[PDB]
Each structure stands twice: as structure tokens, then as C-alpha cells.
Amino acid sequence: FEHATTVPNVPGIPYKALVERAGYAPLNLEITVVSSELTPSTNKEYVTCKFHTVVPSPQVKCCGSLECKASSKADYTCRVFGGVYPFMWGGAQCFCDSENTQLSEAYVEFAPDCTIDHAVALKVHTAALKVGLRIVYGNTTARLDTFVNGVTPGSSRDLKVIAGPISAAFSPFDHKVVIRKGLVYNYDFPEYGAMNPGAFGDIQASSLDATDIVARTDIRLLKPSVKNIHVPYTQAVSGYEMWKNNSGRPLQETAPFGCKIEVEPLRATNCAYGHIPISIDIPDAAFVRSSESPTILEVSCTVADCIYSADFGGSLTLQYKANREGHCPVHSHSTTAVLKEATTHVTATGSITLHFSTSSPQANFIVSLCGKKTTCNAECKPPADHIIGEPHKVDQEFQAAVSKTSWNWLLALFGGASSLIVVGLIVLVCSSML
Amino acid sequence: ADATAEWITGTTSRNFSVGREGLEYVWGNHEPVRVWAQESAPGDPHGWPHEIIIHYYHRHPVYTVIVLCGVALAILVGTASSAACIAKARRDCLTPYALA
Numbered sequence: 001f002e003h004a005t006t007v008p009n010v011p012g013i014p015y016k017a018l019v020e021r022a023g024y025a026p027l028n029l030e031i032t033v034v035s036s037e038l039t040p041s042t043n044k045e046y047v048t049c050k051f052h053t054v055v056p057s058p059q060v061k062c063c064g065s066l067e068c069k070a071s072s073k074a075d076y077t078c079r080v081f082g083g084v085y086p087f088m089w090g091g092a093q094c095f096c097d098s099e100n101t102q103l104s105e106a107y108v109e110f111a112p113d114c115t116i117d118h119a120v121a122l123k124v125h126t127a128a129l130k131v132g133l134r135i136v137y138g139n140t141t142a143r144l145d146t147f148v149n150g151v152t153p154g155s156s157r158d159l160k161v162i163a164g165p166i167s168a169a170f171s172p173f174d175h176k177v178v179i180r181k182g183l184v185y186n187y188d189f190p191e192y193g194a195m196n197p198g199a200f201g202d203i204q205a206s207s208l209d210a211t212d213i214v215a216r217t218d219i220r221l222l223k224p225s226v227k228n229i230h231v232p233y234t235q236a237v238s239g240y241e242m243w244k245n246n247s248g249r250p251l252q253e254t255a256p257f258g259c260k261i262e263v264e265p266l267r268a269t270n271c272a273y274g275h276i277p278i279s280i281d282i283p284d285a286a287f288v289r290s291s292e293s294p295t296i297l298e299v300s301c302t303v304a305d306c307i308y309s310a311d312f313g314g315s316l317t318l319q320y321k322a323n324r325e326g327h328c329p330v331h332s333h334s335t336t337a338v339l340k341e342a343t344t345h346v347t348a349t350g351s352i353t354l355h356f357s358t359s360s361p362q363a364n365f366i367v368s369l370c371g372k373k374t375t376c377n378a379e380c381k382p383p384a385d386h387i388i389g390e391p392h393k394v395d396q397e398f399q400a401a402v403s404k405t406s407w408n409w410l411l412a413l414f415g416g417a418s419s420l421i422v423v424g425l426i427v428l429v430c431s432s433m434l
Numbered sequence: 435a436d437a438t439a440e441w442i443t444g445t446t447s448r449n450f451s452v453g454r455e456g457l458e459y460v461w462g463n464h465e466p467v468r469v470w471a472q473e474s475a476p477g478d479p480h481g482w483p484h485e486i487i488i489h490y491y492h493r494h495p496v497y498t499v500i501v502l503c504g505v506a507l508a509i510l511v512g513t514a515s516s517a518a519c520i521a522k523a524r525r526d527c528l529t530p531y532a533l534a
């Protein structure tokens with residue numbers, strides 16, 4: 001049998017279903033989304049971190065002048081200083097008086113501790129969802145994990161399951177993300193080759209061990225005022241530290257629909273933002289013949305002490321008149337009320353009790369013991385606890401959220417107005433006949 | 435996700451608004467704690483109309499004020515229109531006895 005259904009995306013909150021073959025007894029189906037993860041396709045744009053801003057030894061030439069050429073090193077700034085007098089320890093370093101020339105070099109390169117303290121800039125595309133499902137059918141519990149993109153039988157045994165497309169993918173990661181030390185941030189980093197001094201992405205490389213490193217820090221070389229051999233330089237602040245100072249909060253604290261972000265790989269696990277269609281080709285081994293299943297004859301539910309809340313704040317008792325021996329399932333057919341148990345052992349003409357969760361002030365719903373339906377009503381009360389520790393089992397419906405009594409006064413006033421219009425028009429008719 | 439981050443010193447008290455969607459708070463190095471708000475508005479939706487009014491106003495204020503506005507406008511319009519209809523019928527049926 002191929003059964004199609006639609007389950008919530010919320011991790012936990014196990015979902016009830018009842019499959020009914022024509023020639024077989026009704027059978028339970030319990031679909032639990034135990035885990036989920038959005039793993040988007042990501043590519044490494046670059047890696048950025050501190051710069052060592054290594055300054056080589058100055059090249060002092062004397063009785064003449066030298067010019068320095070361009071180099072492929074990262075952020076190569078080069079200047080030639082004329083009329084110098086280099087004075088190391090031991091005296092003057094050359095002998096051409098006030099014509100001596102000095103060459104000062106400067107380029108940047110990754111810090112020694114950039115292997116750990118680095119930020120990877122990634123571009124995040126659309127995300128494919130994995131979902132782990134616990135399927136309980138025919139007293140048997142099976143664990144499986146499938147894709148959600150559609151047409152992917154990633155299950156095992158005789159259970160074939162197909163997860164339909166997501167109703168509305170929300171993609172918590174933006175187009176551009178930055179991962180630093182296991183923390184993910186939504187930052188619009190500049191592109192490769194686009195780079196500002198004192199800003200994120202000031203230094204750029206394809207990898208931490210890549211020769212091709214490119215940077216545009218505002219480094220510049222100054223004339224040595226003191227008669228020594230130092231290279232005086234002023235450089236803009238590292239954009240890594242500036243971004244670290246004001247990164248804001250990561251995605252682990254700023255994420256819609258309450259789902260947590262992990263790295264290697266980048267994923268958003270346990271996201272609750274929609275519904276997944278599930279098609280199950282349940283095998284015939286779990287199906288039992290209708291004759292061998294103990295059928296009931298007459299039932300009526302009489303619920304007592306209904307309190308509509310996130311927990312299982314209901315208790316309805318069923319009065320069964322069954323004939324043979326065994327168990328055969330229960331199921332609530334309303335989208336506003338969900339039962340707790342799946343099967344119940346029935347002997348003969350006895351009474352069972354069950355617990356249900358609902359969000360409507362009225363509980364006027366159908367419970368089908370073992371195939372034969374029987375509806376009953378309730379007058380449920382609001383809960384005393386303001387804040388509760390586990391999420392709601394059902395969703396509020398606009399028709400069901402209005403209570404029967406409030407519905408009665410609303411239609412009472414509306415029908416009084418409408419019948420008053422009707423009597424006005426027929427009084428107009430009785431005026432028009434004369 | 436209206437994410438609020440605050441560095442806190444000393445014994446204080448902080449107010450946060452929890453909805454049916456839920457609210458997750460992390461306090462220092464502790465594990466995250468998630469809470470949910472359930473419809474526990476004061477009043478009884480199954481009793482007198484004033485209790486229903488205050489309960490549904492505490493539940494959803496804009497929907498409640500607009501539905502009572504709709505009820506009041508509908509009953510006022512209906513009574514005014516049928517009063518006009520009754521006056522029309524009254525003077526239409528009273529004018530043949532008024533010409534004579």
C-alpha cells in the first residue's frame with residue numbers, strides 16, 4: 001500500500017496516522033522526525049587572518065643610487081631614501097657622506113598562529129535537507145534517514161519512503177557567510193581582489209599554505225629620522241581584529257526557527273519551518289486480515305476533565321463492545337486533536353481510557369476505535385501554566401479557536417441582524433402590495 | 435528571531451516575551467533552555483460574554499477589537515436600515531389615509 005501524508009518539520013512531536021486497506025484491518029503508522037539538517041553547497045572563496053607584516057633587511061647602497069622593482073609578494077611597498085647616513089653599531093656603514101642611499105622593503109604574510117585563528121569566507125547556495133525518520137508500523141519500529149528533495153528511496157528493509165519537497169525552504173545562511181573557529185556569521189565580505197585597508201578581507205589567500213597571497217593594507221614607508229638602520233613604517237589596522245571586535249553575534253545565537261549551526265560541514269540541524277510530504281510503500285507483512293482482527297460493535301467516548309494545552313491535557317474513555325480478542329488501533333481524525341496511544345487491547349464490552357492534546361476550546365472530534373468511527377464533544381478549559389516546557393502538539397485553526405458558546409453569540413447577533421433585514425424586506429413587500 | 439544579547443553584572447531581572455513559537459535562552463556557559471507560551475489568557479471562553487471578550491482580547495487584541503467592531507457596525511447598520519424600511523412602509527401605507 002502506498003500511503004501519502006504530510007508531517008510537520010518540527011523535530012520530535014511524533015505524528016499519528018492510520019492506514020486502512022480495503023481487504024485488511026486498519027493499522028497504525030507513527031512518523032517521528034527525529035533529526036534534520038540543512039547542508040548547503042558551499043565553496044571556499046578565500047581565507048583571511050592577521051598579517052605578520054615582515055620587513056626585510058634594508059639594502060643600503062653607497063656612492064650611487066639603486067631602484068627597486070615590483071614583486072609578487074603580498075602588498076609589496078618599496079621606497080628609496082636618498083641622502084641617508086646609516087650608523088649601525090661600530091660606526092658609519094658606508095663612506096659616501098651625504099649621498100648614501102637606502103632601500104626599505106615591506107610586505108605582508110600570514111601570522112604564525114593563522115592555522116587556528118583564521119576566518120574562511122564561503123558562498124552559500126541552496127540547501128538540501130536530510131531527515132531522520134522513526135517509522136512505527138505493525139508493532140515494528142524502524143530507523144531510517146532520507147533526502148527531502150524528492151524521489152529518493154534512501155530507506156532499507158521492505159519500507160520504501162519518499163519525502164516530498166519542502167513547502168517553503170527558508171535557508172538560514174545568507175549568500176555570504178564567514179566561519180571562524182566554529183562560529184558562523186552572516187557577513188558581506190568583499191570579493192577576491194576587492195579589499196580595503198582596515199576592513200575584513202584585507203589579506204586574501206586561497207589557503208593558509210598558498211604562495212599566492214594578495215593584500216592592500218595601507219602600509220607606507222617613512223624616511224628614517226634617527227641615524228640608525230631601522231625601517232620606519234605605518235600601516236593600517238588589521239581588518240581581522242576590527243571585524244573580531246565588532247562581529248556581532250554568530251548564527252548560533254541569531255537563527256530563525258530555532259535550529260543550531262555546526263561546521264565541518266556547514267549545517268543547520270533540527271530546523272522547524274514547514275511540512276514534508278511522505279509517501280510510504282508499506283509492506284503487506286504487517287497487514288493483517290480483517291477476519292482475524294477483533295472488530296468492535298458499538299462505542300461512545302465520554303471525555304472528562306479536558307484542558308487544552310501543549311501537554312496531553314485530555315482523558316476520554318471509550319466503551320467498547322468487541323467480540324474477539326486482541327488489539328487494533330485508535331486514531332483521532334481531527335487536525336486539532338491528537339491522541340497519545342497507538343493501539344489498545346480490547347477484550348469484550350469493556351472500557352478504555354486515552355489521552356489527547358488539543359488547542360481548541362471545544363473538542364468535538366472523531367476517534368475511530370479499530371476502524372469504526374465515533375465522534376464526541378467537550379468543553380475544554382484554558383491551562384493554568386503560562387509557560388510550558390515542551391512545544392505544542394497541534395496548531396491553532398481559525399475555525400476551531402472560537403469556542404462553541406462564543407460561536408453561538410456571534411451567530412446569534414449576526415442571525416438576529418440578518419432576520420431583521422429579512423423582516424424589513426418582507427415588510428417592504430407588504431407595503432408594495434398595497 | 436528577535437535575538438537579544440546582553441552582558442549582565444549583578445543580581446538583576448530581565449523580561450522576555452514568549453510566544454506559541456517559543457523562546458530559547460542561554461545563560462552563560464549553561465546549555466540552552468527552550469520554553470513555550472500556551473494560551474492561558476485570563477477569563478473563561480465558555481462562560482459569560484464579558485469573560486469571553488476579555489479572554490479573546492488578551493489572546494489576540496487586534497482580531498478581537500475588529501470582530502467586536504464588526505458586530506457593532508453590523509447591528510447598527512441593520513437596525514438603521516430596517517428602521518428606514520419600516521418608516522418607508524409606514525408612510526407609504528399611511529399616505530392613502532392621509533390624502534383622504
Ligand SMILES: *[C@@H]1O[C@H](CO)[C@@H](O)[C@H](O)[C@H]1NC(C)=O
Nearest residue numbers: 137138139140286287288327
Ligand atoms: C506485535 O506484538 C504484540 C506484542 O508483542 C502482539 O500482541 C501483536 O500481535 C503484534 N502485532 C503484529 C501486527 O504482528
Ligand SMILES: *[C@@H]1O[C@H](CO)[C@@H](O)[C@H](O)[C@H]1NC(C)=O
Nearest residue numbers: 241242243244245246247248
Ligand atoms: C572593541 O572596541 C571598542 C572600541 O574600539 C572597545 O571599547 C571594546 O572594549 C572592544 N571590545 C569589545 C569586546 O567590545
Ligand SMILES: *[C@@H]1O[C@H](CO)[C@@H](O)[C@H](O)[C@H]1NC(C)=O
Nearest residue numbers: 386446447448449450451452
Ligand atoms: C516585567 O514583567 C512583570 C510582569 O509582566 C512586571 O511586573 C514588571 O514590572 C516587568 N519589569 C520590567 C523591568 O519591565
